[PDB]
Ligand binder design. Structure first.
Ligand SMILES: [Mg+2]
Ligand SMILES: [Mg+2]
Ligand SMILES: [Mg+2]
Ligand SMILES: [Mg+2]
Ligand SMILES: [Mg+2]
Ligand SMILES: [Mg+2]
Ligand SMILES: [Mg+2]
Ligand SMILES: [Mg+2]
Ligand SMILES: [Mg+2]
Ligand SMILES: [Mg+2]
Ligand SMILES: [Mg+2]
Ligand SMILES: [Mg+2]
Ligand SMILES: [Mg+2]
Ligand SMILES: [Mg+2]
Ligand SMILES: [Mg+2]
Ligand SMILES: [Mg+2]
Ligand SMILES: [Mg+2]
Ligand SMILES: [Mg+2]
Ligand SMILES: [Mg+2]
Ligand SMILES: [Mg+2]
Ligand SMILES: [Mg+2]
Ligand SMILES: [Mg+2]
Ligand SMILES: [Mg+2]
Ligand SMILES: [Mg+2]
Ligand SMILES: [Mg+2]
Ligand SMILES: [Mg+2]
Ligand SMILES: [Mg+2]
Ligand SMILES: [Mg+2]
Ligand SMILES: [Mg+2]
Ligand SMILES: [Mg+2]
Ligand SMILES: [Mg+2]
Ligand SMILES: [Mg+2]
Ligand SMILES: [Mg+2]
Ligand SMILES: [Mg+2]
Ligand SMILES: [Mg+2]
Ligand SMILES: [Mg+2]
Ligand SMILES: [Mg+2]
Ligand SMILES: [Mg+2]
Ligand SMILES: [Mg+2]
Ligand SMILES: [Mg+2]
Ligand SMILES: [Mg+2]
Ligand SMILES: [Mg+2]
Ligand SMILES: [Mg+2]
Ligand SMILES: [Mg+2]
Ligand SMILES: [Mg+2]
Ligand SMILES: [Mg+2]
Ligand SMILES: [Mg+2]
Ligand SMILES: [Mg+2]
Ligand SMILES: [Mg+2]
Ligand SMILES: [Mg+2]
Ligand SMILES: [Mg+2]
Ligand SMILES: [Mg+2]
Ligand SMILES: [Mg+2]
Ligand SMILES: [Mg+2]
Ligand SMILES: [Mg+2]
Ligand SMILES: [Mg+2]
Ligand SMILES: [Mg+2]
Ligand SMILES: [Mg+2]
Ligand SMILES: [Mg+2]
Ligand SMILES: [Mg+2]
Ligand SMILES: [Mg+2]
Ligand SMILES: [Mg+2]
Ligand SMILES: [Mg+2]
Ligand SMILES: [Mg+2]
Ligand SMILES: [Mg+2]
Ligand SMILES: [Mg+2]
Ligand SMILES: [Mg+2]
Ligand SMILES: [Mg+2]
Ligand SMILES: [Mg+2]
Ligand SMILES: [Mg+2]
Ligand SMILES: [Mg+2]
Ligand SMILES: [Mg+2]
Ligand SMILES: [Mg+2]
Ligand SMILES: [Mg+2]
Ligand SMILES: [Mg+2]
Ligand SMILES: [Mg+2]
Ligand SMILES: [Mg+2]
Ligand SMILES: [Mg+2]
Ligand SMILES: [Mg+2]
Ligand SMILES: [Mg+2]
Ligand SMILES: [Mg+2]
Ligand SMILES: [Mg+2]
Ligand SMILES: [Mg+2]
Ligand SMILES: [Mg+2]
Ligand SMILES: [Mg+2]
Ligand SMILES: [Mg+2]
Ligand SMILES: [Mg+2]
Ligand SMILES: [Mg+2]
Ligand SMILES: [Mg+2]
Ligand SMILES: [Mg+2]
Ligand SMILES: [Mg+2]
Ligand SMILES: [Mg+2]
Ligand SMILES: [Mg+2]
Ligand SMILES: [Mg+2]
Ligand SMILES: [Mg+2]
Ligand SMILES: [Mg+2]
Ligand SMILES: [Mg+2]
Ligand SMILES: [Mg+2]
Ligand SMILES: [Mg+2]
Ligand SMILES: [Mg+2]
Ligand SMILES: [Mg+2]
Ligand SMILES: [Mg+2]
Ligand SMILES: [Mg+2]
Ligand SMILES: [Mg+2]
Ligand SMILES: [Mg+2]
Ligand SMILES: [Mg+2]
Ligand SMILES: [Mg+2]
Ligand SMILES: [Mg+2]
Ligand SMILES: [Mg+2]
Ligand SMILES: [Mg+2]
Ligand SMILES: [Mg+2]
Ligand SMILES: [Mg+2]
Ligand SMILES: [Mg+2]
Ligand SMILES: [Mg+2]
Ligand SMILES: [Mg+2]
Ligand SMILES: [Mg+2]
Ligand SMILES: [Mg+2]
Ligand SMILES: [Mg+2]
Ligand SMILES: [Mg+2]
Ligand SMILES: [Mg+2]
Ligand SMILES: [Mg+2]
Ligand SMILES: [Mg+2]
Ligand SMILES: [Mg+2]
Ligand SMILES: [Mg+2]
Ligand SMILES: [Mg+2]
Ligand SMILES: [Mg+2]
Ligand SMILES: [Mg+2]
Ligand SMILES: [Mg+2]
Ligand SMILES: [Mg+2]
Ligand SMILES: [Mg+2]
Ligand SMILES: [Mg+2]
Ligand SMILES: [Mg+2]
Ligand SMILES: [Mg+2]
Ligand SMILES: [Mg+2]
Ligand SMILES: [Mg+2]
Ligand SMILES: [Mg+2]
Ligand SMILES: [Mg+2]
Ligand SMILES: [Mg+2]
Ligand SMILES: [Mg+2]
Ligand SMILES: [Mg+2]
Ligand SMILES: [Mg+2]
Ligand SMILES: [Mg+2]
Ligand SMILES: [Mg+2]
Ligand SMILES: [Mg+2]
Ligand SMILES: [Mg+2]
Ligand SMILES: [Mg+2]
Ligand SMILES: [Mg+2]
Ligand SMILES: [Mg+2]
Ligand SMILES: [Mg+2]
Ligand SMILES: [Mg+2]
Ligand SMILES: [Mg+2]
Ligand SMILES: [Mg+2]
Ligand SMILES: [Mg+2]
Ligand SMILES: [Mg+2]
Ligand SMILES: [Mg+2]
Ligand SMILES: [Mg+2]
Ligand SMILES: [Mg+2]
Ligand SMILES: [Mg+2]
Ligand SMILES: [Mg+2]
Ligand SMILES: [Mg+2]
Ligand SMILES: [Mg+2]
Ligand SMILES: [Mg+2]
Ligand SMILES: [Mg+2]
Ligand SMILES: [Mg+2]
Ligand SMILES: [Mg+2]
Ligand SMILES: [Mg+2]
Ligand SMILES: [Mg+2]
Ligand SMILES: [Mg+2]
Ligand SMILES: [Mg+2]
Lengths: 76, 63, 97, 44
RNA sequence: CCCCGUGGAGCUUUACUGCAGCCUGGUGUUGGCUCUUGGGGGCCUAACCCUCGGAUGGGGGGACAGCGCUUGGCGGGCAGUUUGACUGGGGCGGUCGCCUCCUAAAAGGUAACGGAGGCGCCCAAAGGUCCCCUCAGGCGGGACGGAAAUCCGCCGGAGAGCGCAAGGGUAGAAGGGGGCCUGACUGCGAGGCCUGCAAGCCGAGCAGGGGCGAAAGCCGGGCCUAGUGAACCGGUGGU
RNA sequence: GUAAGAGGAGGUAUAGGGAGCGACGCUUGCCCGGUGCCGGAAGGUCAAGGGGAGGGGUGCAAGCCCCGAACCGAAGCCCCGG
RNA sequence: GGCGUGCCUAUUGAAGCAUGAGCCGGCGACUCACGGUCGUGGGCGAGCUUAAGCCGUUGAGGCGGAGGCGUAGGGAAACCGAG
RNA sequence: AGCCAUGGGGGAAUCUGGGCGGACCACCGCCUAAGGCUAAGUACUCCGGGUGACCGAUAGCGCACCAGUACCGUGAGGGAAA
RNA sequence: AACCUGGGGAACUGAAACAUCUCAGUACCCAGAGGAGAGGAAAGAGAAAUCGACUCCCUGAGUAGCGGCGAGCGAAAGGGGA
């Protein structure tokens, strides 16, 4: 019957959708690879995690052959 | 009669002035080997509990 | 029936030796805010004579408060509280021990 | 093989992991100590 | 009957831990003479033991044995106990933590002794940075070669590679090569992800002193997700 | 039975204790590697103890106090045989 | 004539062919002590309160500050102090 | 791991003597082992008395009454009703 | 009757198993003491160059400590009293 196995659920995916206000440093997206590329005011960590770089608003940009991007349009 | 303080607790926890309860971070005396220097630097700072803060406090009281 | 949380660890070192307690002079702190509660002069004796001290023996004046000019004895003073009282009056240090 | 670096003209330590048999007989990479600043560190 | 209870009891042993008992060194009770290199051999008598028609004595043993304290050992004769859970009843078999995919019903999460596979490591280069280069495959041509070694030409956007399972990602590099290199730094850490707890994860920036770069900058190990263990008790180094 | 003592026995190996087989007849084969038991003045390991190179605490010193190597140490186990 | 599946218990589910009860009367099960933690009624307030005991009394109370909680926290500690 | 006590082995001194103040040493101090006695304050309640926001005959002691009785059990012991 | 001292001394139980540990020097057995028994005039306490026999209460204090540092166990100096 050798089969009763699996591994923990990692609860990844988009953590902050477009339009949502965000504090600097808080996380935008956890992902397997780069299903989302960083972009303006958004850094990326060892696991490919995208995190806002300054208080602002999240917005997503698709750029075809160049992939999708997550941006934080600042304001204060 | 007359509750005795739980010595096991007192030996590893403190009630803060506001009624919080703190203790050293676990996992820093063994698993050690080369865990990111960051980890152990953060296993040094002590923390506060949550609900067992209340479980914990009851075990004291004369304290 | 698993671990309580007794998973946490004792840091409080020196939780005791065999004979245990070492008798060393205990200092009770007392702010000069409660000290201005009156006037004349103050000493350990007078302080215990009402609310504060409670025979904790070693007096140590300190802390926030508007200092009255009066003379005050103590087993020790706050670096900062010392200046406040010295900057309006005078006061002697401990007896000795 | 498990390992920890020692500072020269002193006795500081740090997290480390050698590899024994494989190409690695000597080891003395750099590492910043708390006292002083920057120095070689022996295997030990 | 059957199963359950961190129930009971009788029995067993090369289950654990003890105990009686038996073995054993040292020492007390414990003395004399002699040979020998505190030990060994021999003799003695008076301790101590046995015995003899009372014995204050005779005979036998004899510093042994017995007994006291202490050393180690053998030790179901005996004693106290342990002997897991899941489980289409229980035992037998199988399984127990971690990662990947599917089941999972287009957020997250989601069960079954549902379908399938991996981890308990590895690397001082397989790391940091600067600089340069771009796969697999197919066809054609080429002394060994012969489907396939190395060379040339044309097509080829990724089907290659990325240490290792799978997945996601990826040449506008994360892949191949080179120069210098050790940031597989110390002191911290705004704000988050995840979450019953405890844990786990990401992290801008500040300070110190550094590495590569002309510089903008990048570096707090490795394309990422497994490679692991609270507390207790003890070891080594240091203030 | 803690002991004193008692049974064994007021017996003495043609006796007493334990074990297994179970009148009688004919028989009872091979293995001693493992386990037990028996034998083995060697050797190996082995406790308290003896020993005291060397080391430490403290005092001004005389000293006091602790640690400790080689070596000598029984049964048991290993080993050798039945 | 219409209508109508005892009571309790235990259960996913009981009139149940699951439990307990022949009937009646009486006995019969969430207490107290000390220590906690909230709430609440009052007394006092940077203070509040006494314990054993002593003096009264014989269902009268007072005295007694030793001591306790509070007025400062942070640190393993040395120590420092509104930090 | 001192102090107090002591089963085993070794084994002193009489104040220049001894014990102790938590291993040990120095310093500074405390106390005088190895003989015995001593009231009061303390504990208890068979017995007497006083008092209960104590019971009121299934209660209150097991027993308000001829009860540690009848009865039960070899016995230790159990034990009513009224 | 109970109270007391000395000589011996359990287990269920708790630790949600169990062996150190707990229950506990409790239950109980034995010897003895008396209206009480024990203790008792420092070879003490322990940090004050301080206290001054013993017993009892309050406090110190669930403190100092002890502890498979688990369950749990738990002092003394000092201060107020008899
Ligand atoms: Mg098959
Ligand atoms: Mg599964
Ligand atoms: Mg894509
Ligand atoms: Mg980074
Ligand atoms: Mg720890
Ligand atoms: Mg602890
Ligand atoms: Mg003491
Ligand atoms: Mg390894
Ligand atoms: Mg290895
Ligand atoms: Mg079990
Ligand atoms: Mg024995
Ligand atoms: Mg002998
Ligand atoms: Mg012997
Ligand atoms: Mg002898
Ligand atoms: Mg002898
Ligand atoms: Mg000689
Ligand atoms: Mg000689
Ligand atoms: Mg003779
Ligand atoms: Mg003779
Ligand atoms: Mg004779
Ligand atoms: Mg003769
Ligand atoms: Mg003779
Ligand atoms: Mg002998
Ligand atoms: Mg003997
Ligand atoms: Mg034996
Ligand atoms: Mg044997
Ligand atoms: Mg054995
Ligand atoms: Mg055994
Ligand atoms: Mg079935
Ligand atoms: Mg089955
Ligand atoms: Mg079976
Ligand atoms: Mg099985
Ligand atoms: Mg599953
Ligand atoms: Mg495999
Ligand atoms: Mg690589
Ligand atoms: Mg190029
Ligand atoms: Mg082909
Ligand atoms: Mg071809
Ligand atoms: Mg060709
Ligand atoms: Mg070709
Ligand atoms: Mg060719
Ligand atoms: Mg050729
Ligand atoms: Mg061919
Ligand atoms: Mg060809
Ligand atoms: Mg070509
Ligand atoms: Mg061509
Ligand atoms: Mg492509
Ligand atoms: Mg493809
Ligand atoms: Mg691919
Ligand atoms: Mg590959
Ligand atoms: Mg790879
Ligand atoms: Mg892939
Ligand atoms: Mg691109
Ligand atoms: Mg490369
Ligand atoms: Mg490269
Ligand atoms: Mg290279
Ligand atoms: Mg910050
Ligand atoms: Mg944070
Ligand atoms: Mg959490
Ligand atoms: Mg909790
Ligand atoms: Mg950074
Ligand atoms: Mg800098
Ligand atoms: Mg960075
Ligand atoms: Mg690593
Ligand atoms: Mg790599
Ligand atoms: Mg990288
Ligand atoms: Mg790389
Ligand atoms: Mg992942
Ligand atoms: Mg433990
Ligand atoms: Mg015997
Ligand atoms: Mg005897
Ligand atoms: Mg006889
Ligand atoms: Mg006989
Ligand atoms: Mg006879
Ligand atoms: Mg015979
Ligand atoms: Mg025979
Ligand atoms: Mg045969
Ligand atoms: Mg044959
Ligand atoms: Mg054999
Ligand atoms: Mg054989
Ligand atoms: Mg043989
Ligand atoms: Mg044999
Ligand atoms: Mg065998
Ligand atoms: Mg053998
Ligand atoms: Mg054997
Ligand atoms: Mg022989
Ligand atoms: Mg030998
Ligand atoms: Mg040999
Ligand atoms: Mg050896
Ligand atoms: Mg020795
Ligand atoms: Mg010296
Ligand atoms: Mg010296
Ligand atoms: Mg000197
Ligand atoms: Mg000196
Ligand atoms: Mg010396
Ligand atoms: Mg020795
Ligand atoms: Mg020899
Ligand atoms: Mg031997
Ligand atoms: Mg054997
Ligand atoms: Mg032979
Ligand atoms: Mg009808
Ligand atoms: Mg119905
Ligand atoms: Mg009812
Ligand atoms: Mg019916
Ligand atoms: Mg039935
Ligand atoms: Mg039933
Ligand atoms: Mg019924
Ligand atoms: Mg019922
Ligand atoms: Mg009936
Ligand atoms: Mg209640
Ligand atoms: Mg209440
Ligand atoms: Mg109030
Ligand atoms: Mg009061
Ligand atoms: Mg007064
Ligand atoms: Mg007074
Ligand atoms: Mg603290
Ligand atoms: Mg002592
Ligand atoms: Mg002795
Ligand atoms: Mg003399
Ligand atoms: Mg002289
Ligand atoms: Mg003494
Ligand atoms: Mg003394
Ligand atoms: Mg001493
Ligand atoms: Mg003393
Ligand atoms: Mg001392
Ligand atoms: Mg002294
Ligand atoms: Mg003294
Ligand atoms: Mg005297
Ligand atoms: Mg005498
Ligand atoms: Mg005397
Ligand atoms: Mg005498
Ligand atoms: Mg007396
Ligand atoms: Mg009473
Ligand atoms: Mg009574
Ligand atoms: Mg009476
Ligand atoms: Mg009466
Ligand atoms: Mg009434
Ligand atoms: Mg009646
Ligand atoms: Mg009536
Ligand atoms: Mg009755
Ligand atoms: Mg009567
Ligand atoms: Mg009857
Ligand atoms: Mg009856
Ligand atoms: Mg006894
Ligand atoms: Mg037990
Ligand atoms: Mg038991
Ligand atoms: Mg238990
Ligand atoms: Mg209980
Ligand atoms: Mg239990
Ligand atoms: Mg059991
Ligand atoms: Mg244990
Ligand atoms: Mg005890
Ligand atoms: Mg006792
Ligand atoms: Mg007794
Ligand atoms: Mg007596
Ligand atoms: Mg009296
Ligand atoms: Mg008396
Ligand atoms: Mg006496
Ligand atoms: Mg005197
Ligand atoms: Mg002391
Ligand atoms: Mg005086
Ligand atoms: Mg004193
Ligand atoms: Mg006094
Ligand atoms: Mg008290
Ligand atoms: Mg322990
Ligand atoms: Mg005890
Ligand atoms: Mg006192
Ligand atoms: Mg006073
Ligand atoms: Mg007094």
């Amino acid at each position: 019957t050798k089969n009763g196995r699996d591994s923990q659920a990692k609860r990844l995916g988009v953590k902050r959708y477009e339009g949502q206000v965000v504090r600097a440093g808080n996380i935008l997206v956890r992902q397997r690879g780069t299903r989302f590329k960083p972009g303006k005011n958004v850094g990326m960590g060892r696991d490919f995690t995208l995190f806002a770089l300054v208080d602002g608003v999240v917005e997503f940009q698709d750029r075809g052959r160049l992939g999708r991007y997550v941006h934080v349009r600042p304001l204060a | 009669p007359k509750m005795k303080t739980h010595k096991g607790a007192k030996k590893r926890v403190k009630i803060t002035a506001s009624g919080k309860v703190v203790a050293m971070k676990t996992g820093k005396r063994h698993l050690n080997w080369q865990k990111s220097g960051k980890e152990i630097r953060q296993k040094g700072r002590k923390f506060v509990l949550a609900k067992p803060e209340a479980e914990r406090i009851k075990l004291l009281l004369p304290y | 029936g698993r671990s309580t949380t007794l998973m946490r660890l004792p840091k409080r070192g020196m939780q005791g030796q065999v004979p245990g307690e070492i008798k060393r002079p205990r200092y009770q702190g007392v702010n000069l805010k409660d000290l201005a509660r009156f006037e004349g002069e103050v000493t350990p004796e007078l302080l215990v004579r009402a609310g504060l001290l409670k025979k904790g023996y070693r007096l140590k004046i300190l802390g926030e408060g508007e200092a009255k000019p009066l003379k005050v004895v103590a087993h020790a003073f706050s670096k900062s509280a010392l200046e406040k009282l010295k900057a309006a009056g005078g006061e002697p240090v401990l007896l000795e021990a | 093989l498990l390992l920890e670096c020692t500072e020269c003209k002193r006795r500081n330590y740090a997290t480390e992991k050698n590899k024994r048999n494989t190409p690695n007989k000597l080891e003395l990479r750099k590492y910043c100590p708390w006292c002083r600043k920057h120095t070689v560190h022996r295997e030990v």
